[PDB]
Design a protein around this nucleic acid. Sequence first.
RNA 1: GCAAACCGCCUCUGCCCGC
RNA 2: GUGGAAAGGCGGGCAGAGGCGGUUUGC
Lengths: 263, 190, 377, 162, 278, 287
Amino acid sequence: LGVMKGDVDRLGEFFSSMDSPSKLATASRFMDYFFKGYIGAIIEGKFGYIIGDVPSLRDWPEEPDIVVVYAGGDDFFIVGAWDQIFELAFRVRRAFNAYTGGKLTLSVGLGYFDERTPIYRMADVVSERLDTAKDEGRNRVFVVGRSRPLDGKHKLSYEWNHYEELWRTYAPRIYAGNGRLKGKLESKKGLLWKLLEIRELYVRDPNDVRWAYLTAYLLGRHGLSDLFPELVGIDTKAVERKEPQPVYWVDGVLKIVLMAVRR
Amino acid sequence: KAKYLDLKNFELALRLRPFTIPEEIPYARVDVPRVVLDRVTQDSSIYFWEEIRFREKSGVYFLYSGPREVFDGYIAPAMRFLGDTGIGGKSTWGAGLFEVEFHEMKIDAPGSEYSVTLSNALPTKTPVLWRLLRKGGWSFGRRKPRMTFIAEGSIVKNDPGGMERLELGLSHEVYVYGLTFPLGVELPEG
Amino acid sequence: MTERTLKVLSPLHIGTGNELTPVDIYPRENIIHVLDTERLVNDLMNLGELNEILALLKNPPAYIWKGYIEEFHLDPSDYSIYTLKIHGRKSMQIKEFIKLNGRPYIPGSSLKGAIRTAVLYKALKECDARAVMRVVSKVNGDVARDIGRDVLDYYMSFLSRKRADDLLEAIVFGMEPDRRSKIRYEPKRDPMKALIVRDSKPVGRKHLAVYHVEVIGNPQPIPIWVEAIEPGAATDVEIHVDTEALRLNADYFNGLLWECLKERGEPGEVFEDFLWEAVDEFYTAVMKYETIEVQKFSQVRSFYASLEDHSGHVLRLGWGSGWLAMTIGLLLVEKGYKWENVRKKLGLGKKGSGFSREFPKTRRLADGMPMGWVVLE
Amino acid sequence: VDASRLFGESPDVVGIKKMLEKGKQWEAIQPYFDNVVREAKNFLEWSPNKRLANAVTVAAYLTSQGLKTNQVRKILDMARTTELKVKRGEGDIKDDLVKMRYLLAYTVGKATGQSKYSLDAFHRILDPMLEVLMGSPKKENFEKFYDFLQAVVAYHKFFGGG
Amino acid sequence: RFYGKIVIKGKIKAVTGLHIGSQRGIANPVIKDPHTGLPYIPGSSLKGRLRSLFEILVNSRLGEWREKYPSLANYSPGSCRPDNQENCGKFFNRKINRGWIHVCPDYETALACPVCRLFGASGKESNFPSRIIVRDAFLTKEWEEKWRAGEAITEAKIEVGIDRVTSQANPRTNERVVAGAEFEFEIIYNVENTTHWRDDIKNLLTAMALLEDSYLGGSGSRGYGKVKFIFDSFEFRPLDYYRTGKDEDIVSIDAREKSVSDILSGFDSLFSEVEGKL
Amino acid sequence: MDRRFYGKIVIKGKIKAVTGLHIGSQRDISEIGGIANPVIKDPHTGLPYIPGSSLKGRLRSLFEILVNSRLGEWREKYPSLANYSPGSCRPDNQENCGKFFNRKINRGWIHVCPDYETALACPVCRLFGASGKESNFPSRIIVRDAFLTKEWEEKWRAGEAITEAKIEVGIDRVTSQANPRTNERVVAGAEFEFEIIYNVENTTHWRDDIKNLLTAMALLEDSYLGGSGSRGYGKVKFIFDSFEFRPLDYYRTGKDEDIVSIDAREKSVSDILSGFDSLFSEVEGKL
RNA sequence: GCAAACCGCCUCUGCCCGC
RNA sequence: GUGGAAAGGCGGGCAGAGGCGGUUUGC
Ligand SMILES: [Zn+2]
Ligand SMILES: [Zn+2]
């Protein structure tokens, strides 16, 4: 069961900019109308020129299985199918990017839960996954729960344009649409689960370089030297810029596809 | 949004100084699933259970002011009994167990007319700035009534607190702790 | 039956893909010896280094690199085979036999792959009028096998590492549903998954000897040294068909072999009797075919005329069985030009193409004996 | 071109795999890096990515030759068993490193033909490290050896050999 | 009334791969400490397996134990599963959600049942608390150091499902703890009554002796259990220990003894001072 | 309904790999240079072993096919086999009907009874157990993992090969072109110490559950274990040490009160053979 | 006088049901 | 005089089907 919980970021500074009561009464209706009327027409599949290409597991249904529990004026707590809660968070973000002039942001926590979980626990988890995305950059999404070292250099949440660019590179080569993989990777999930175990060696010690050639051997003996040509060679510029390796951010793209598959 | 502070940053917030919040909470609230297995057919029935899982060096502690003859007569022999039974929760699954050490804490606090409560309050008079806590526990299988406490860190003025004794249909009277633990604090104009 | 013992009538080499370098060997006599480098090298230290790691990597003028142990030492050998021929000037690479503890046995994967060639030959003889009804079910390509007209007359023009037998094994053993090609093999649909052969008991050291295989078919013959089981060794092997595995699969097998068993009676009952009638019709037919060519050595024909009046089931194994005995192409002799364009398509001679001796030119026989004959019963 | 592609740490993992799928450019620039590997005679010469840098330059120069992994498996499985002894079983590999030197010496004493150079360059590299490993500890300074020898074989599958 | 706390320390030896799942990158993960990532054996998977083995032990001996333990006279061997009525005549009398457990319905009956006196009962107007505390078993210092030395502590094992006719293979993976591991357990019995504690220790050792021939969690029937109790020390912790704090507890010495060299091999011998001080 | 406990018939011994055994794994576990298709291995000691899953399932595979041969001959002795007809649910993709192989696991049909009391009268699913919705009958045998025996531990220390590499080549018949691969296998003659624990629940039918477990053992020495046994790799031989009984009074006392049957020189076809009742007569004197 | 060439894996399966 | 008391994440599931270490011809 997929749960998203989002709100507009640095909104109190926006309404403090209004200097007259007619100007406040305009900015507080237009922000109210996005989470009251126009969030319905996003779930209704409209506005395709404005939204565009978003990370979708399955293609967009005529009737989405989405139950909007709350949507207040900045805050929204929406539950639904975990494949369509995932896509809608990128579909709400892009429309809110263009309903404004690109000046106000969102932040979304995302959880994936058992059915038979108490709902006060699904709120208290996603409220923590929202606040983890909120004290980091306030234009960034929490996608999936993820392991990372406690060195303070790694952060669990993706920025919006970062994850949506990680999806346009890594998903059209391993994923075909509607819960199936591509050619030459059918019946090869054992590549992908062990690929996350090589990602766990980055988690246990990021200074150890043992993950670099184990990726090259495991992609090598399967003949898949074309897939993932940057998980084999270490990025020296990332060690220069003090940003994580590309083996670290591939978890949010693989683990969604491994959940999309029967697994 | 911050809930706790360091031993050093607490002494700054008592003086209305600039302070910083800690980066890391020493525990987590995980949800371990258990199961109830049938004795003949091994049928499963999952329920969920939440916990508090501490880190490698982390733990929990409380503070004691009082005469030393009451401490090593009552508080100190009681905490070693409680090292082998629990503090709340499923003590039969090994939850509330610990090892006890005794140390010394010293807090720099400004002398004032007001004070913060480092425990639950159950005040006599109405406090200054507070935060409601509403809980009532259990006593020998008897369900205690919910009592409006005050959460920790709330501000009182010249308040001692006071325990309420309850009946609950037992043989002995049940006292419920609501004494305050006053440390001096500096306030603005309300 | 169980434990159907065999005997050995010609030299028999089951390879392991390994040769003995001359640093492993020092023949003191007409007998040869396999020295133990791991023990001998670690035993020649007490008298002392880095000279052994330098000289063995150098490989100078073999003889002296194995006779230098004779100075102040002797007697470090493992198996000590016999040469049994007028050769060995070391300059040789003895190909070794498959051994489980230094003891020669016959692997069961090698005796099953010889029965599978005999069984494939029987299926293509009897099964073009019935070969269309097999691929009439979920293949839709039998019309190409009907318009060509006995699926062999199509397969010579159908082709016109190497996956040449991919369609022909998919017709006689396993019809699949569909592929990018017409049909393919399915291992789950096979009568030969009920054929259980097991590794034999180990033969013995006394029956193992080195040989000197001369290649005949060119004016300059080449020798190859190899070790093989001497003729006259008899071990025991157990072969049985699990009839219970055929009763469960009476509806799931889809092949021409299954359409050779439903005509001798109950198809889960005559498969073991069909099995040996396929053996004595592939291997007796390749036995008679080699009496035509007389390019060998005389005495070779006196071996083939003596292979008759010999009880039991005669079949090839091993390494000296030529292209005629590992391959359907005994049946592809009667085509001629239908196989002549395809044999150059597949290719053969190297270092263009062999014109008149394309397939059968090489004969590998050890000491004037055509090697690789084992007779079950 | 090839020397600029073959940079310091991970110059072109994606780039050298395309160029190795060549003749004159890699017969010289990788020869300098093979000589750079032999000039680093100490096995503990690289606490950084330079073990991962040498082994890419090694396995690019060996992929230009044949280097059948099947020929080397007697050494490669022997390196597996000696590392298995380090897990509280044994602590002296000197009685068996000589065997592993001998199995390295027996392999080049067998490998004759077009595949001499595929084993001559392989002979050139591991033996100055096996010179160091004779008089060395085996939990440390052999840890850095066996991880180097894995990365040689590992990138050799990525560059397209075996 | 409180008299002391018999404390049972030792080790759990996973002779075969032990799997205690969680169902949340391996497809079926054993549970783990979230801060270290190390596996552990819970105190609740150990206790419900000591109890499920011991309740079937009592279920076979209802008639033979009517006069050593009362309130086994109100139970008939069997479950109350067909007739959906709790606290009926049969033994496994309480339905929780879909499973039937022997839990005695009152305090006045759980003081006589051998299961519920040792393991506890819920009841209505009863709440009989248990007398044992089973801690979470964590890896021994020697096995946390192998985690530091870069080893694998949890393997991943692949099984397969095969058709009985066409041999279609259908595999899945199961993470399980590497065989040979050493855990550290702890069981603290609470001496409430001073008369029937020998029967509560000798029943707890019987539950452990059945656990060394059954399995602990997981697949088990396909060989994922095979546990072994390695005792270190039994300590008494008297009532005089908790008041004055001076270290005069009574310590048994059993460095290398089994669960069956401890039940009667030394039971008159090892508990000689504990049965004297009471 | 009515689960009881009387004891645990324990069947120890050794497994002799008369022909070389291959229980395959997958690789890629931080392993670089090795034989393709490796035997599974104990990660702590390094040595190969036989899983209890590979042995409990292989005995189930041979015994379910033995019962499918006779669905008119066992039904006079066991009820609920009259619910089943010989066949499979492969020609009709429906789970529970008259066909004897009824559970689609993922794609493969395996005889598992869907209910408790249907499986309580089934000769297969009372010995090997069953899953179901609301019934879930559990098993009565547990088969543990079989590591190398203590003397073959010592041969690994001495340097003797505990594995080997057999190369098998597949040859296309038309072009005679080899397609070589190398298969690791345990050396023939190796020996693994095994463990089968039967859990005695109903004293009315426990003769049969040992006579059916010893039937599937004798079917396994006729069949193969693991591997590619149609090409040689099977040929398991069971060497018993000792049947033991472990009564209920053992686990309460601690005294060695177990009834120890001795077949230290007997065979799996010799235990089922005349003498079954000569060897288990003191178990019946205890029950 | 003795070899030197190529082939070194191929193709089907991959968590269900039950709270 | 303890938001407590009772509660196994497990029941069933062969890493399996097919496969001659082979053939060719010269430098
Ligand atoms: Zn009870
Ligand atoms: Zn059944």
